[PDB]
Amino acid sequence: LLKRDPLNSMMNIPAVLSRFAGKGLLLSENGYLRWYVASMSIGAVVVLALLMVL
Amino acid sequence: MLLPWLILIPFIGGFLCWQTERFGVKVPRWIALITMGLTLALSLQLWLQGGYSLTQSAGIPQWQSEFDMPWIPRFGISIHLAIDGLSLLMVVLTGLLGVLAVLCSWKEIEKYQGFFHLNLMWILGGVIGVFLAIDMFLFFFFWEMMLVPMYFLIALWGHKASDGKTRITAATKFFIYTQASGLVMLIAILALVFVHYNATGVWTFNYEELLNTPMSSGVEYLLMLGFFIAFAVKMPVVPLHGWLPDAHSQAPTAGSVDLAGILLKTAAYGLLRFSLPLFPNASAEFAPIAMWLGVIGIFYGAWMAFAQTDIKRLIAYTSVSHMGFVLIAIYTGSQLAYQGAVIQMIAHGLSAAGLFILCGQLYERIHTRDMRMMGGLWSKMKWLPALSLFFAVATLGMPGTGNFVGEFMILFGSFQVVPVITVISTFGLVFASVYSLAMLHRAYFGKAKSQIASQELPGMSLRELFMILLLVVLLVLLGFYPQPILDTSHSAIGNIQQWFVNSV
Amino acid sequence: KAFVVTRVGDVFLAFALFILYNELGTLNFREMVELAPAHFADGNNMLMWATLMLL
Amino acid sequence: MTITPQNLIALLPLLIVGLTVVVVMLSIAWRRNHFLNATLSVIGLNAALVSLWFVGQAGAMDVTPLMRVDGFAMLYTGLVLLASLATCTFAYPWLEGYNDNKDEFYLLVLIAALGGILLANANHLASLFLGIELISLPLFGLVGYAFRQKRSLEASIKYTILSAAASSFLLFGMALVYAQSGDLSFVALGKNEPLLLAGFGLMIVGLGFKLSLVPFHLWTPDVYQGAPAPVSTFLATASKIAIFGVVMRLFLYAPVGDSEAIRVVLAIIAFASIIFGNLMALSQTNIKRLLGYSSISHLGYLLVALIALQTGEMSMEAVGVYLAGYLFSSLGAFGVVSLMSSPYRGPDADSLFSYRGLFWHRPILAAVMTVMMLSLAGIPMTLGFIGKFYVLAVGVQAHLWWLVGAVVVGSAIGLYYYLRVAVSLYLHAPNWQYSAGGIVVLISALLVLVLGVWPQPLISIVRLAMP
């Protein structure tokens, strides 16, 4: 059961989660400029919402 | 006085080897040997000239030599190099290991060799600077800059850019697992200094006035966890040690001598010097968690050592078993236990260095790394396996080796303070025997027909045998006659223990 | 197998060695002989652990 | 107030550069020569650096109600001038291979220097607008310089629509604040009703496009791949260096920035900027997109200092030194990228897979990219580490535990791609102003090394400048 080292692998999951979450963020980028402006509107929406809950 | 020079010779030698790289190619090997000879000369001069048998109760501030210099005056960051007795043992050990590193790299010419040696002296000088460090920022800067040049060693010299397994897993885990915790202890340093700045009103980064800073309970506990996390990823402790076998199995075995024999020293040095005295009540509360992690480390490293099939990962998993004794030693209230840890720690370096030199030596003889593939090489090699038998014998508690007196005075002091966690701990010796015999029988006992490549074997040169003979005789004298270095470390160990006793 | 078994016995032997230093201080045989009854006026229960594990 | 000679000596940076545009434009119409225009433009920017000494003879004072000249603005004008000096020296080797009209380049960079040195000096909301747009119009037009490629025009058009959009958000926010307050002067502002705060959020949108913040970062890859590498030197360094000064001064002076309602929103943007930069930055195999990804994270570290500007006076020098270190690191890295394109070559083929080797091709230039690339990360012996160290100290000082933790874990994530490029320059291999371009990046390499090992003299300059 110790032919492969368990705790080295189970503390590598920060790197696994970071790399996979980084790949998802790269896939979130599109290149189509309409969604860039939609990102600007949706940042304005959340900033005003986050300011009105304060 | 001698301390600025004694941390700078490694950096000066790297500049000069790379300067004379244009002049010649056989120069940096001979330049590097002499420069490490000068390092041990100054280190041994401090051992002999200094009053190593000094007063056992001269307070917490006591130093044979001391250097101060303003570096960043806005926070009081100063080059506060100061050498104690046990710090001087650390310096002489790394000077000797540096001689072994530059001797194992002899007759190793490549496309570039001056780059390798300026990096080699840079990393060894970084460890010396950690060992002489009283200012917290200087300690942290040296702690983190010895950590960058080994990455280039594992990357460009783990294998010459052919396979991608020498960077993206081995070297990268080595780098991240240390630096995240280094930043953790930096913010721990800053939280401690800020609570001291509220108390008194001066921006200071010095150890003597941060030693007795007034802190309310429930506050210094978090800073003690913050110090211990960075001190638990460098020496192998139970939750975070996955970098160690990958780092040792991929770096060249000279880089592995640096990675095992002396990088493992500095964390327990910091647990003795920077974590115990600053946080007495937090460490007194945290003690039983440390004992549980210590016993788990010994048993865990031996099982993982028994279960492994290669050799570099095998000795790399002996190291995590060895350091569990040291951690239980530090987190107890006994003077004898701490003095056992020091001799165990010096012997740990001396018993890992010879094995790694010889494992690398065996690989370049046979061009095969897997242990179970070979077997029965005793009829072929003439001096490698006999000397290797004693080093595997010196790994466990065999008397006449320094490891026995080391681990075993810890157990005396540990049973003096607390019975039940010690009586669990002693059983690692039985487990130390089983992975020691597993190494010996799988590698050397058997028939040479286990491998086809075990039928044409080279000879062994004189200088490798010379540097193996010196280590085996040096390790036997430490096992038989350990009094001189215990008399050296008595006062430094004593005031740390008296402060840990009296401050609670 | 002999090596593993003899070191199990040596762990058992060193256990009594820790207990004797904790209880009676000096490990010399004769000084132990006329120090053992001086230290043992009150408690005796733990000496059987020392001696059984010495055995 | 009227014009006094004190005002003219204070205005000397905005003046020498403007006189340079006129002389450069007359010289273009006279001869249309590349050598004369490059010489005339670099002489004017060097004359602006010389005249920084003369405004240092003048104290902290106003010129008009639009501007306030302090010693803080002296340092920021200097950062912008060296970036303009840096971009013209990197453009001559790239533009020697350009087919025609090789002379409009320096005219636009000179206009952008006017815009940068106008956002250094700010005291009224209108000067904020005259500066943002003066620099955008060259950046509207210079990423579209050499439109003969299929992607330069693409990059120019994407940046054009988006930058006009941000300016329209900034202007609409700028007025919605002035509805409550009687004046738009930074100091006179705020003399927490929702319309002023709502107007403030609109200015954050219009400012966070150019500062490349988390929901506005989408332009920073594409134009950095599309623009010429000489333009990327200016677009990475000078624009955001100049822009960060005015957004810091607004929160320092305005009493509305003291309130926690704006503080929480900017902290979350800073938190997400570090994370949403350093996670998507790993997978890239293109060097220009790689530097554009790192820019988002560097501006995030600047924000985690800026949120604690109001708690402790160490944040002023912390922002200043990280900007100085960030300038030198990006100029060296982007200069090596542009120095690989010694001719125009049409579309330059630069990628992380295209940078195998490069030490046995050109060893000195590989060393500069490695030194700067380790300086971007946080490795010691480099000026980026001292800048990283102050922003950690500022976050510790102000008890922003989530934000300082984000920098550390962002550093932990972002170490990975910097190190690959550092080692990829060591795998197996697959004119006079060019030597001048090499001298600029080699000079920067020496500077970042000596100010990482020995960082005190740069702090003395910064505390000399800070008021």
Side-chain angles (χ1 to χ4, degrees):
Chain A
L1 188 153
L2 271 293
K3 60 180 174 183
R4 83 281 183 274
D5 170 39
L7 294 176
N8 169 36
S9 303
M10 270 76 88
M11 311 276 197
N12 192 31
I13 62 169
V16 174
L17 190 149
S18 74
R19 181 177 65 83
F20 277 131
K23 273 297 296 175
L25 259 59
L26 181 71
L27 260 61
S28 314
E29 284 196 346
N30 294 338
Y32 304 100
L33 186 62
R34 305 160 183 80
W35 182 97
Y36 284 15
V37 188
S39 309
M40 294 253 158
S41 192
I42 205 39
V45 159
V46 71
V47 160
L48 283 198
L50 285 196
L51 280 166
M52 291 315 79
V53 298
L54 287 165
Chain B
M1 202 295 278
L2 297 164
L3 304 194
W5 269 86
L6 172 152
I7 76 173
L8 204 46
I9 306 145
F11 306 135
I12 297 169
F15 279 154
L16 188 153
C17 283
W18 192 61
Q19 277 312 112
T20 61
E21 170 78 16
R22 295 100 181 174
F23 284 90
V25 294
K26 65 183 182 67
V27 184
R29 55 183 72 183
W30 198 103
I31 289 304
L33 205 59
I34 292 173
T35 46
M36 291 316 218
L38 272 295
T39 303
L40 280 178
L42 291 169
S43 312
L44 291 163
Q45 272 186 13
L46 274 153
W47 207 96
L48 196 146
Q49 293 302 310
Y52 63 93
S53 299
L54 59 87
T55 304
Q56 70 268 16
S57 189
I60 304 166
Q62 59 178 27
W63 288 288
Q64 307 167 356
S65 200
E66 172 146 40
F67 185 36
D68 194 359
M69 170 196 267
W71 190 24
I72 304 168
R74 190 269 187 190
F75 311 97
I77 297 169
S78 61
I79 314 294
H80 203 249
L81 297 174
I83 172 170
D84 215 359
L86 59 89
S87 307
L88 176 48
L89 291 164
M90 296 296 172
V91 175
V92 299
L93 176 64
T94 181
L96 193 42
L97 285 185
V99 172
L100 274 69
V102 299
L103 269 171
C104 178
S105 67
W106 200 279
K107 272 167 269 175
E108 304 266 330
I109 187 64
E110 280 282 326
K111 173 70 163 172
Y112 264 117
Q113 184 269 9
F115 279 120
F116 168 54
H117 266 70
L118 70 89
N119 194 290
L120 205 75
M121 319 275 268
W122 281 3
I123 190 167
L124 291 169
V127 187
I128 290 193
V130 176
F131 280 142
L132 310 169
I134 300 299
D135 199 287
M136 312 294 304
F137 194 80
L138 189 67
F139 159 74
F140 173 63
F141 167 86
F142 272 112
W143 173 279
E144 185 178 1
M145 62 80 71
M146 67 181 180
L147 190 57
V148 64
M150 203 63 223
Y151 194 71
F152 265 82
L153 272 173
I154 303 180
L156 193 43
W157 290 85
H159 193 275
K160 277 288 194 167
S162 175
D163 45 354
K165 66 159 285 204
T166 80
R167 281 83 65 193
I168 208 164
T169 298
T172 316
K173 256 55 179 183
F174 165 71
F175 206 108
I176 297 169
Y177 282 173
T178 60
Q179 288 273 1
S181 311
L183 290 166
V184 159
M185 62 146 288
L186 174 66
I187 77 165
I189 282 182
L190 290 197
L192 175 69
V193 171
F194 184 77
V195 300
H196 181 239
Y197 186 51
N198 289 348
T200 61
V202 64
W203 275 111
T204 177
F205 272 19
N206 218 40
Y207 161 57
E208 296 99 13
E209 45 263 53
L210 283 171
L211 180 72
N212 72 47
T213 183
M215 294 178 71
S216 66
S217 62
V219 176
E220 72 267 62
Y221 200 94
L222 186 53
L223 311 196
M224 171 284 308
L225 313 171
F227 265 95
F228 182 76
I229 289 162
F231 291 148
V233 298
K234 186 51 74 74
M235 71 171 259
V237 193
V238 176
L240 295 174
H241 63 86
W243 61 279
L244 200 81
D246 292 331
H248 287 147
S249 58
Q250 190 58 48
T253 194
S256 185
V257 160
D258 301 346
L259 272 166
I262 204 67
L263 260 68
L264 267 70
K265 306 290 97 175
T266 81
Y269 181 46
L271 289 175
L272 267 166
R273 170 69 62 187
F274 280 126
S275 174
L276 211 45
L278 276 68
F279 310 106
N281 314 67
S283 173
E285 283 203 26
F286 195 52
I289 295 97
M291 330 285 287
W292 289 325
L293 268 69
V295 298
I296 288 297
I298 292 166
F299 277 88
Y300 186 24
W303 285 350
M304 187 66 204
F306 186 78
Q308 218 273 326
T309 184
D310 198 72
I311 319 165
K312 290 289 199 295
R313 314 191 73 115
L314 190 56
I315 294 92
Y317 279 125
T318 75
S319 296
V320 59
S321 64
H322 275 174
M323 291 335 278
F325 292 114
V326 192
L327 189 153
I328 297 169
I330 295 169
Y331 269 87
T332 51
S334 162
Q335 168 175 111
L336 174 64
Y338 295 9
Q339 294 178 357
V342 169
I343 183 65
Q344 207 269 356
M345 186 187 283
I346 301 299
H348 178 65
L350 293 179
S351 175
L355 274 174
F356 282 138
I357 283 180
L358 291 179
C359 169
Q361 204 94 30
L362 169 65
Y363 183 23
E364 65 183 1
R365 254 51 150 180
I366 71 168
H367 296 285
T368 292
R369 264 212 180 286
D370 206 343
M371 153 164 55
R372 72 188 189 275
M373 186 64 72
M374 53 205 168
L377 305 172
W378 202 309
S379 65
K380 301 272 190 172
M381 310 334 296
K382 55 195 289 288
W383 282 71
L384 164 71
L387 304 166
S388 173
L389 162 67
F390 190 84
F391 275 119
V393 161
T395 300
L396 72 164
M398 192 294 268
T401 73
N403 200 3
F404 160 69
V405 296
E407 292 176 354
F408 197 74
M409 315 152 57
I410 310 170
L411 289 166
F412 266 117
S414 304
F415 189 63
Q416 263 304 100
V417 298
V418 61
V420 65
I421 193 66
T422 301
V423 302
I424 298 169
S425 313
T426 58
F427 287 113
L429 209 63
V430 178
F431 293 106
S433 314
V434 308
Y435 59 71
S436 309
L437 58 85
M439 189 205 158
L440 282 154
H441 209 269
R442 290 172 204 166
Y444 321 106
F445 289 148
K447 279 187 173 183
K449 313 168 176 293
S450 308
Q451 199 176 331
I452 298 285
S454 293
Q455 268 65 61
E456 183 194 10
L457 278 299
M460 172 145 178
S461 183
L462 73 165
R463 49 160 202 85
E464 280 95 344
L465 192 148
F466 289 156
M467 58 196 195
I468 293 309
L469 274 193
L470 176 59
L471 274 294
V472 67
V473 299
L474 187 73
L475 188 153
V476 175
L477 275 296
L478 262 67
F480 266 116
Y481 194 20
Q483 196 49 53
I485 63 170
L486 295 191
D487 269 349
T488 297
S489 78
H490 185 93
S491 175
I493 300 299
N495 54 247
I496 295 181
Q497 188 259 5
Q498 292 159 20
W499 174 238
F500 195 33
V501 161
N502 301 339
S503 190
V504 166
Chain C
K1 175 192 211 53
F3 206 56
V4 168
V5 167
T6 192
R7 296 302 285 261
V8 161
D10 273 5
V11 163
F12 284 167
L13 169 57
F15 265 126
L17 183 61
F18 312 153
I19 297 169
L20 279 181
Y21 180 75
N22 189 23
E23 182 57 15
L24 299 155
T26 174
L27 307 173
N28 176 14
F29 293 117
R30 39 233 70 196
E31 294 294 328
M32 196 71 108
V33 158
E34 67 273 15
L35 191 151
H39 188 93
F40 265 80
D42 297 2
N44 192 136
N45 198 19
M46 80 78 69
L47 183 62
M48 282 73 75
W49 262 117
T51 47
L52 293 173
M53 173 75 107
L54 176 56
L55 173 53
Chain D
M1 81 295 278
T2 59
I3 290 177
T4 181
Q6 290 89 17
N7 282 359
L8 298 175
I9 291 173
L11 260 180
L12 201 44
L14 262 171
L15 289 171
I16 306 317
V17 182
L19 199 56
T20 317
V21 191
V22 175
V23 172
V24 162
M25 198 174 251
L26 267 295
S27 67
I28 277 172
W30 196 4
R31 304 290 91 190
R32 199 90 159 159
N33 189 359
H34 205 197
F35 191 77
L36 278 167
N37 284 310
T39 308
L40 261 51
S41 296
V42 72
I43 276 172
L45 301 159
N46 283 316
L49 280 182
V50 166
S51 89
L52 270 163
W53 182 257
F54 293 169
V55 65
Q57 313 264 20
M61 50 76 88
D62 291 331
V63 188
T64 51
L66 277 73
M67 281 146 48
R68 152 84 54 81
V69 179
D70 280 352
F72 182 83
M74 281 202 57
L75 177 72
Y76 277 59
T77 289
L79 292 153
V80 176
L81 269 294
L82 281 72
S84 296
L85 295 161
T87 199
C88 74
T89 60
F90 299 150
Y92 195 89
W94 175 81
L95 269 175
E96 187 65 33
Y98 198 35
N99 52 331
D100 65 325
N101 58 322
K102 299 188 281 263
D103 292 331
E104 298 155 321
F105 189 83
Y106 310 124
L107 201 53
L108 279 182
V109 175
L110 262 51
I111 300 284
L114 293 174
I117 71 190
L118 169 59
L119 266 202
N121 308 335
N123 199 18
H124 194 273
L125 249 47
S127 195
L128 188 151
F129 161 91
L130 282 144
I132 282 171
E133 314 308 334
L134 241 76
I135 209 176
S136 74
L137 274 295
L139 285 180
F140 273 112
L142 272 186
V143 298
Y145 203 108
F147 38 75
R148 301 293 181 90
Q149 286 90 326
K150 45 190 307 180
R151 53 202 41 200
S152 308
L153 184 85
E154 167 186 9
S156 177
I157 296 169
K158 301 211 284 270
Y159 185 50
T160 299
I161 302 299
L162 281 196
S163 161
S167 294
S168 185
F169 270 102
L170 175 86
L171 200 67
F172 182 75
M174 244 206 287
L176 290 203
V177 305
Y178 171 58
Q180 202 34 60
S181 294
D183 194 6
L184 301 103
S185 203
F186 296 118
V187 263
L189 194 145
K191 300 294 187 291
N192 288 152
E193 69 94 19
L195 172 69
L196 183 48
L197 302 195
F200 263 113
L202 293 158
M203 322 164 77
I204 296 169
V205 176
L207 285 165
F209 163 73
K210 292 275 184 29
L211 292 163
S212 297
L213 306 189
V214 62
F216 324 122
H217 70 301
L218 277 298
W219 72 287
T220 61
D222 291 78
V223 65
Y224 277 52
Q225 164 45 50
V231 192
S232 296
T233 300
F234 194 89
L235 182 62
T237 62
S239 168
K240 296 182 289 294
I241 276 173
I243 289 157
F244 199 83
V246 74
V247 66
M248 172 165 188
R249 191 175 292 203
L250 158 73
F251 278 131
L252 168 78
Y253 284 163
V256 194
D258 299 332
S259 164
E260 288 280 324
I262 320 171
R263 294 251 280 261
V264 172
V265 182
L266 203 77
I268 300 299
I269 288 171
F271 181 76
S273 305
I274 293 158
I275 296 301
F276 284 76
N278 296 132
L279 281 72
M280 66 180 289
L282 288 92
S283 48
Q284 190 48 251
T285 61
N286 197 356
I287 190 66
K288 276 171 173 175
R289 271 174 144 268
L290 189 147
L291 298 162
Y293 285 151
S294 81
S295 164
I296 309 147
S297 63
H298 288 337
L299 274 295
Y301 303 148
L302 278 188
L303 287 184
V304 302
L306 167 60
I307 193 66
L309 161 65
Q310 304 274 39
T311 312
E313 293 292 327
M314 192 255 268
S315 174
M316 211 76 68
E317 73 207 33
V319 162
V321 299
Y322 193 74
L323 276 181
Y326 170 60
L327 181 63
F328 304 140
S329 62
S330 296
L331 294 174
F334 269 116
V336 174
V337 165
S338 167
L339 259 59
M340 271 327 278
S341 181
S342 49
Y344 176 43
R345 220 186 286 175
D348 179 70
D350 44 349
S351 178
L352 195 147
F353 188 75
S354 88
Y355 283 161
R356 313 291 161 231
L358 268 297
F359 203 51
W360 297 267
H361 298 104
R362 274 82 161 281
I364 297 90
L365 318 175
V368 192
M369 169 71 81
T370 313
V371 162
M372 296 297 173
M373 184 62 61
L374 299 199
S375 179
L376 283 192
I379 285 185
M381 294 182 286
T382 47
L383 195 48
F385 168 63
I386 296 89
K388 171 67 69 65
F389 163 95
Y390 291 177
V391 298
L392 294 175
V394 161
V396 160
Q397 267 190 332
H399 293 57
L400 298 151
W401 301 117
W402 328 109
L403 286 88
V404 59
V407 175
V408 167
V409 303
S411 309
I413 297 169
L415 274 155
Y416 174 70
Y417 42 93
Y418 299 140
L419 290 198
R420 295 176 327 158
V421 176
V423 299
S424 289
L425 302 174
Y426 298 96
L427 295 175
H428 182 74
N431 51 87
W432 296 78
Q433 304 298 322
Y434 195 48
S435 304
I439 279 164
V440 161
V441 298
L442 186 55
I443 277 169
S444 200
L446 289 172
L447 274 188
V448 68
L449 284 166
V450 299
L451 295 161
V453 185
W454 199 258
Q456 184 45 50
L458 189 145
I459 298 285
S460 76
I461 296 169
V462 166
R463 322 271 291 291
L464 183 63
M466 291 325 88

